[model samples]
Target: MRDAVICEPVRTPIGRYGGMFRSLTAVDLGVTALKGLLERTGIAADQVEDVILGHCYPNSEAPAIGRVVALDAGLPITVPGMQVDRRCGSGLQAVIQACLQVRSGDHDLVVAGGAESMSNVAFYSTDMRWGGARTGVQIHDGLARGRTTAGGKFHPVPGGMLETAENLRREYHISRTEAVRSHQRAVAAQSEGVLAEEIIPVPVREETISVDEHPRADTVELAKLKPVLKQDPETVTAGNSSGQNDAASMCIVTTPEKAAELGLKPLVRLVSWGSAGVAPDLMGIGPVPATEVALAKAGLTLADIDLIELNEAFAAQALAVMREWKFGEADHERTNVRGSGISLGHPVGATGGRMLATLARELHRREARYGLETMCIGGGQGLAAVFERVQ
Candidate 1:
């Protein structure tokens, strides 16, 4: 197997629901980042072998979004494209697949990541009928639906996303006080300009969209918000949960030989990857074992890691994973060091790529050797990847 390295991932500034990027489609944001990758790296158009993009909500306009984005970004017509859907982990899944493909000699160079427009997830009409052809009102939001496996089997995530977070809160005794502290860290990081490294300024209507638009400067706001799922005192609030937003992120990955041949200096090198599964209801805790697997593959341990970029799906869930790893609390200075989904926003399919980008940039800034990027999937799965600074 050949070596694979990653170029710095680039992403559009995350826009809040119906905010700066509401007018733009997922393809537009994806193309912007794709073009940015080429513009910054100086890689020739024809050198790219393929494009793999992750998108949770399939758009009506861009059915083959990967192909549409590749052409729109001015890549050669010969380059093939594919779209992958792994729910929230879709973006990082693309990154892992790129490394595997390159290591297996399947392709030398691949552009991989994800994009999403939560505001545009859309609604679909029910195609079912009762009796002759009757239906009262069966229309539903695409985002709201029952979970099903490929084998036509039903697998519910227990009490669903919110309830799962509450379970962790109740079981671990995670309080709103601790949750507020987490939110404060994100707010402070953004205010201190700590997140300027990985973000790419994307062109939008009147002015260019550069900074994240979701995180609020106020610290006590989350504590005042009501519970979302149940009245069991509402452990998970909108303030602590990832916000729905719009964004896109992508990275250029290729063989080390190919990178050297192209005279390209990689941002980071892929060391190893791993995944694991847990109870569907305990989805948030999935990252614990996944991280263990990746570290073992790299022949390393938690002590060897310099930093971590775990998706902040919910503060309660993140806390659960931390406690499972035997950590009492999250040190914002390390985890989500430059703010996270709570303040930066979470564009489902695009978040994993965004996390990878942030991890690489932080590793460089700190002159750190090893970093881990991991996230919990919607079902009962988790994923983790180990990366090392090239220099």
Candidate 2:
């Protein structure tokens, strides 16, 4: 197979939902990251052949967001761009597509990742044309709108994100205490500067947004928080779930020859990637098979992976996957050292790309050889990518 390597990925510091990036659109966020990526690597925009951006919720306000981002970032108009979405897996999917392009000799260099302003996911509306009315019912937000599915013997509800997480918590027999501790670790990791290596400051308006807003270092009062998803005492809470965040991340991918030609260092080699689907309600466990396929294709096993950047949409979700995959406490301590989405924030469309960057950085820092970037998708799918350090 033709080889594709990834460059050091750059990302805008994650912003809290409706926080620092509230005023910035998804395109705006992408512009910052894309511009930074080019400047940081000294790569000219004209050299980029394509730009693919994954988006979970494409804002109607900014159609062709990727194209807008490309032009806004000063890329040549000849360079084409397209948008792709695989729900929560969109970010990594973009990277996979770029890698495939390079490996197929369709392109020598590509810019791919994802961007989302969940805070700006515009409210939708349903036309009432059947009633011959000019007005329509406004839908609150599409953030939680999962994919379509076929129910077994019954119809399912429209949204199942939190409900699916609740199912994981119950089926996995995970307790509230354990979940809290897991979340606390993410919080501690962030405050301790474990994630400092992967984040880059984003200039927004007058003040710059340099840090993630979701990871609360001070969780002493976590006990007082109310459950965000349920009234039951042992139910899901905002503290134990990844917060909705806003950000953009992208990376350069090209053949080794192309990297050499550009005088750029390849951070990691994209060994393999895989995608799988499970029952929508059991989406959290989908990562199990996803990881298996990725490792299998790479001719490796979990033991060979030095670290894992698993998106923690919910602490229970991560716990379930960990149990299914048989990862012990020590394993988690050594792998997700800087915390996952629970602390770092989940800007849905951008998280997988963030994981790619984090895994590469962590692998180099720890002098590890291999790393896995994996996550559960919103609509029952899971995605995994295997990477090996260039050195």
Candidate 3:
């Protein structure tokens, strides 16, 4: 078996929904990030064996998004592409799939990442094709509809992702203070320039956007925000929950030998990864089991991980995962030190790549040997992966 290494990982600056990147389509964002990765790595387009992208809200605008993105990004037609979706875990799944392909020696070079433009999700009609029924045609907000239906029929979450977070909050006894900490950490990371390296500038109209547009410096005031569900003793709020976002993140996945031959620095090697399922109602607890499986597969323990990037899908969700792992204050310091979903914005499919980009870079910067990236899925699932710094 061969080894797969991640190289030239980069992501476009995350834009809040209907914000800076509102005018761009998901395909446009994907193409921009893909081209940027190619330009940064100086890799010949024809050398790429495949392009795998994760997209959650695909539309007729781009069918088989990966192939569309590859063609739009000017990759040779011979370089085939495909799309994968594991909801929020889609992006990380793409990377893992690429690693598997390379490890199996089926391909030496590939592009793997995710793209999402939540702002562009259309107001779709399900019954339009056959004409309206007696009840009349109903319009659905694609974004909102997705959240309501993602949990599947077996585990229907009427209140959507927010309700899941609230479920975790009550179960874990999470406080609003914990939610504020996510925003604070994200703001700190932004001010400290901790998140600068991995972001590739994206051209929006006449201007270029190089920095993330989500971190709020006034997070302390978020404590005053009302709970979105408006339930008594509620903790989940718009301020604490992740926002709809737009962005794309991509990386070159190839063998170490190929990276060396191309003079591309291998940032990290895929050590092991794990995926696990949990009760949909308490989906926030997902990362706990997923991480356990990954640690077991890696022949390591939580104590061995040098850094962690746990996507803050919700502060309650994140806190629940950390608590389950028995993380202490010191452990908190090493986890999401650069901020995450709550503050950095979560663009569903793109979230995993965003986390990986940060985790891999932070590992090398700290000269750490091992790092872990994990996130909870919307539909009662979690994905976790361990990586080792190439150095």
Among these predicted structures, which one has the highest lDDT? 3
TM-score of each: 0.92, 0.92, 0.97
> For candidate 1, which ten residues in a row score worst on lDDT?
146-155
Expressed as tens digits, the lDDT of each residue in 64-165 for candidate 3 is 898999999999889999889999899999999999999999999999999999999989897888887666899999888888787788789878888888
Q: Which residues of candidate 3, in runs, are more than 4 Å off?
A: 219-221
Q: Indicate the TM-score of model 2.
A: 0.92
> Relative to the unseen true structure, what is the C-alpha lDDT of residue 230 in candidate 1, on a scale of 0 to 100?
53
| Whole-model lDDT, model 1 | 0.80
Per-residue lDDT, model 1, residue 340, is 72
Q: Compared to the true structure, candidate 1 yields what TM-score?
A: 0.92
Instruction: Tell me, by TM-score, which candidate is best.
Output: 3
Residues 1-391, candidate 2: write the lDDT tens digits: 5889988687888888978889998998999889888877899778999999998888666677778889998998899888898878999999999999899899999998899988888765555445435564555456654333322335463436677888898888987666344446656756677565566678777877667776654543465667664444565677778888899998998988989998988889999989998878788777899999999999998888888888888888988998987877788665666667877788988997888887887788788899899999876789999999986
Assess the local accuracy of residue 197 in candidate 3 as a C-alpha lDDT between 0 and 100: 72
lDDT of 1 by residue, 227-289 (tens): 774556347777788877999998989877888898877778889988887767777777899
Cα-based lDDT at residue 155, candidate 1: 51
Candidate 2, residue 97: how far the Cα is off, in Å: 0.5
